[PDB]
Amino acid sequence: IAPITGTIKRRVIMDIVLGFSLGGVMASYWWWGFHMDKINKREKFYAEL
């Protein structure tokens, strides 16, 4: 009989790990999807200047 233990422990770990990973994409899409797009269109008008 396998001593099933710590089901909560790793379930806790994955929950916290996913939260940072899912929050990682949310944070990363803001920086490199939206915010980085804003900088490039900003620089183009200044580049023509």
Partner: protein, 36 residues
């Protein structure tokens, strides 16, 4: 543990992305439907 957790975890991330997109993305509906 990979077999058991897969049946429950991965579907929820898809449901997760839906509700949070509703609470935060609702004003996008008003602007598109008729910014007019």
């Amino acid at each position: 543990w990979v077999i058991t957790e897969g049946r429950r975890l991965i579907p929820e991330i898809f449901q997760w992305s839906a509700v949070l997109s509703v609470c935060l993305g609702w004003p996008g509906a008003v602007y598109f439907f008729s910014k007019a």
